[PDB]
Design an enzyme around this catalytic site. Structure first.
Site, PDB file in Angstrom:
ATOM      1  N   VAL A   1     -16.281  -3.038  16.121  1.00 33.57           N
ATOM      2  CA  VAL A   1     -17.276  -2.465  15.431  1.00 33.57           C
ATOM      3  C   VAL A   1     -18.364  -1.556  16.217  1.00 33.57           C
ATOM      4  O   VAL A   1     -18.889  -2.087  17.220  1.00 33.57           O
ATOM      5  CB  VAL A   1     -18.545  -3.548  14.853  1.00 33.57           C
ATOM      6  CG1 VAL A   1     -19.712  -2.769  14.102  1.00 33.57           C
ATOM      7  CG2 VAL A   1     -17.669  -4.370  13.958  1.00 33.57           C
TER       8      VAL A   1
ATOM      9  N   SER B   1       1.931 -14.178   3.784  1.00 28.54           N
ATOM     10  CA  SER B   1       0.628 -15.027   3.718  1.00 28.54           C
ATOM     11  C   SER B   1       1.168 -16.392   3.338  1.00 28.54           C
ATOM     12  O   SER B   1       0.499 -17.334   3.754  1.00 28.54           O
ATOM     13  CB  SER B   1      -0.036 -14.522   2.688  1.00 28.54           C
ATOM     14  OG  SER B   1       0.831 -14.211   1.598  1.00 28.54           O
TER      15      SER B   1
ATOM     16  N   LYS C   1     -23.605   2.235   9.031  1.00 22.24           N
ATOM     17  CA  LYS C   1     -23.131   2.384   7.876  1.00 22.24           C
ATOM     18  C   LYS C   1     -23.576   0.903   7.264  1.00 22.24           C
ATOM     19  O   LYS C   1     -24.079   0.707   6.063  1.00 22.24           O
ATOM     20  CB  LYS C   1     -21.452   2.505   7.530  1.00 22.24           C
ATOM     21  CG  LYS C   1     -21.572   4.058   7.652  1.00 22.24           C
ATOM     22  CD  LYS C   1     -19.833   3.986   7.791  1.00 22.24           C
ATOM     23  CE  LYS C   1     -19.373   5.617   7.371  1.00 22.24           C
ATOM     24  NZ  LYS C   1     -19.663   6.519   8.524  1.00 22.24           N
TER      25      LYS C   1
ATOM     26  N   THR D   1      -1.727   6.738  -4.975  1.00 20.30           N
ATOM     27  CA  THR D   1      -1.144   5.805  -3.684  1.00 20.30           C
ATOM     28  C   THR D   1      -1.056   4.398  -4.130  1.00 20.30           C
ATOM     29  O   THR D   1      -0.230   3.579  -3.413  1.00 20.30           O
ATOM     30  CB  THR D   1      -1.977   5.907  -2.425  1.00 20.30           C
ATOM     31  OG1 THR D   1      -3.490   5.642  -2.732  1.00 20.30           O
ATOM     32  CG2 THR D   1      -2.065   7.459  -2.102  1.00 20.30           C
TER      33      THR D   1
ATOM     34  N   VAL E   1       0.785   3.317  -6.420  1.00 21.84           N
ATOM     35  CA  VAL E   1       2.374   3.190  -6.950  1.00 21.84           C
ATOM     36  C   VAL E   1       3.116   2.926  -5.930  1.00 21.84           C
ATOM     37  O   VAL E   1       3.133   3.755  -4.650  1.00 21.84           O
ATOM     38  CB  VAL E   1       2.355   4.451  -7.787  1.00 21.84           C
ATOM     39  CG1 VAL E   1       4.143   4.225  -8.095  1.00 21.84           C
ATOM     40  CG2 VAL E   1       1.593   4.734  -9.105  1.00 21.84           C
TER      41      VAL E   1
HETATM   42 MG   LIG Z   1       4.047 -10.571   2.010  1.00 20.10          MG
HETATM   43 NA    NA Z   2       1.958   3.801  -2.723  1.00 11.46          NA
HETATM   44 NA    NA Z   3     -18.668  -3.574  19.238  1.00  8.99          NA
END
Ligand SMILES: [Mg+2]
Ligand code: NA
Ligand code: NA
Ligand SMILES: [Cl-]
Ligand SMILES: [Cl-]
Ligand SMILES: [Mg+2]
Ligand code: NA
EC number: 2.7.7.7
Length: 326
Positions: A56, A171, A63, A92, A94
């Site tokens: 950061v 995951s 922001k 995008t 798709v």
């Molecule tokens: Mg995966």
């Molecule tokens: Na895509």
């Molecule tokens: Na930083």
DNA sequence: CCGACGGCGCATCAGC
DNA sequence: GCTGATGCGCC
DNA sequence: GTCGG
């Protein structure tokens, strides 16, 4: 999710930079900041507070100050109103349509789901399948379904050759309660870093999964990587399950640990770990960890007998898969 | 300031 | 046909 | 956009 508003903002900015600006380093910067903020265990009160986190900087801190004050970001408010940006960002979503193809389609006046469906002849194979399952591919997979899919793949693979080992990564291996797709690492003792003693090792497995109607479509396929679509079987009178993305990666058996490290991710974890490796004088890929010679050329593969060995080389404490969801 | 930012498989295409 | 560049994908 | 030197 103490800081969901901020991380959502940064992710949307990240996607804008990738899809519209085509600025991949800005994309990665935004995602890195969102990730470090996501794990920060306090509700952020100011940009300054956030700026103490690595990834950061001054601009994101600014922001964050705007967002905390107003609950929004003017920069994003404008982007959302830009027709061209909105179209590109949509296309995008798709599978198979990236930033380049998206801008080209918009140029040709193809900018909606309806436009795509009536211009199927303009899509490559991958894109056609991506469109076909547009809705399905945006649904998450509950872990319960992942377990059913695991059983099918592990059991069918065994039927092909008891020597295959298939490991579900992504995951799922990080213990997620839901996954975006199914990632399967495959090994067979006939395929090592030293030789390929049997051809079609990946093919035979894909073939078997098609035969039982688990794999339904193919996005791309080579000797070591399959990218496609699959579907759980449904019972009598039962609504069908959504089609799901599946990726299968055949890795040399003797390079399993580097492979499973890679395929476990997350993607941001891999980037962070690989960058740390470079800083430590090593380069990591899904096959090996190697030293970097004084020049800058990678040296020979170092011995690896566990995932942990890889962390040791780069002087990181070992992190279990469940702690790699960056 | 300014260079680096992870690494690679498959599809598609241009040049020869 | 091959090789290299680029797009898009995976973690 | 951020970081290191
Ligand atoms: Mg995966
Ligand atoms: Na895509
Ligand atoms: Na930083
Ligand atoms: Cl960039
Ligand atoms: Cl290698
Ligand atoms: Mg992913
Ligand atoms: Na995947």
């Amino acid at each position: 999710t103490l800081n969901g508003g901020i991380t959502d903002m940064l992710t949307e900015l990240a996607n804008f930079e990738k899809n519209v600006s085509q600025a991949i380093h800005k994309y990665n910067a935004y995602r890195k900041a969102a990730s470090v903020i996501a794990k920060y265990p306090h509700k952020i009160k100011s940009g300054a507070e956030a700026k103490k986190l690595p990834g950061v900087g001054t601009k994101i801190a600014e922001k964050i100050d705007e967002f905390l004050a107003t609950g929004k970001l003017r920069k994003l408010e404008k982007i959302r109103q830009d027709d061209t940006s909105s179209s590109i960002n949509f296309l995008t979503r798709v599978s198979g349509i990236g930033p380049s193809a998206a801008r080209k389609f918009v140029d040709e006046g193809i900018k909606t789901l309806e436009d795509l469906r009536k211009n199927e002849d303009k899509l490559n194979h991958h894109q056609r399948i991506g469109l076909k399952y547009f809705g399905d591919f945006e649904k998450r997979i509950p872990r319960e379904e992942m377990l059913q899919m695991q059983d099918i793949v592990l059991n069918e693979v065994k039927k092909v050759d008891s020597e295959y080992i298939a490991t579900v990564c992504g995951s799922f291996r990080r213990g997620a309660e839901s996954s975006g797709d199914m990632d399967v690492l495959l090994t067979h003792p006939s395929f090592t870093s030293e030789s390929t003693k049997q051809p079609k090792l990946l093919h035979q497995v894909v073939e078997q999964l098609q035969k039982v109607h688990f794999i339904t479509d193919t996005l791309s396929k080579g000797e070591t990587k399959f990218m496609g679509v699959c579907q759980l079987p449904s019972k009598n009178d039962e609504k069908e399950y959504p089609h799901r993305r599946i990726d299968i990666r055949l890795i040399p058996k003797d390079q399993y640990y580097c492979g499973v490290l890679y395929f476990t991710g997350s993607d941001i974890f891999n980037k962070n770990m690989r960058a740390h490796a470079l800083e430590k004088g090593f380069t990591i890929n899904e096959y090996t960890i190697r030293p970097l010679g004084v020049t800058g050329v990678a040296g020979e593969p170092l011995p690896v007998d566990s995932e942990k060995d890889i962390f040791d080389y780069i002087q990181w404490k070992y992190r279990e898969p469940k702690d790699r969801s960056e």
